[PDB]
């Protein structure tokens, strides 16, 4: 809730197969001035998550 | 009569998966059905109800 603005999660739809196995979720991130760095930068939001 | 055999004997028809399209509350298996296929041999063709 420090970086994330919102999460759109879609089930039956990925980019690979179209089955149930496959889904994805587009995450929107907080405004531009409301982030320092490195811990608010996409590269690490990602590291954390992955 | 020969014509209308090669047709039904050699067609190829659909039938759902299992889950896939709206399943029942809590499901553990989804996989595709495989109904009729098309013949693949001279001999395989030879064998047709006429």
Residues in chain A closer than 8 A to B20 (CB atoms): 19-20
CA B20, CA B40: separation in Å to the nearest integer?
A: 30
Going by the DSSP 8-state scheme, the letter that residue A27 receives in this structure is E
Write the burial class of residue A29 (CB in 10 Å: 0-12 exposed, 13-18 middle, 19+ buried).
middle
Residues in chain B closer than 8 A to A19 (CB atoms): 20, 30
Angle at B5 between CA B4 and CA B6, to 5 degrees: 105
Whether A19 and B30 lie within 8 Å, measured CB to CB: yes
Please name the method used to determine this structure.
X-ray
3 state SS for chain B? CCHHHHHHHHCCCCCCCCCCCCCCCCCCCCCCCCCCCCCCCHHHHHCCCC
φ and ψ at A11, to 5 degrees?
-85, -80
Cα of A20 to nearest chain B Cα, Å? 7
CA B15, CA A18: separation in Å to the nearest integer?
A: 18
């Amino acid at each position: 809730k420090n970086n994330v603005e919102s999460v759109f999660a879609v089930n039956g739809f990925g980019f690979a197969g179209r089955g149930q196995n496959t889904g994805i979720a587009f995450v929107s991130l907080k405004d531009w001035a409301d982030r320092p760095g490195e811990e608010n930068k996409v590269e690490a939001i990602t590291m954390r998550a992955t | 009569d020969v014509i209308t055999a090669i047709k039904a004997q050699n067609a190829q028809v659909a039938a759902g998966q299992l889950g896939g399209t709206p399943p029942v509350k809590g499901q553990q298996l989804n996989a595709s059905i495989i109904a009729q296929t098309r013949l693949t041999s001279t001999e395989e063709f030879g064998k047709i109800l006429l």
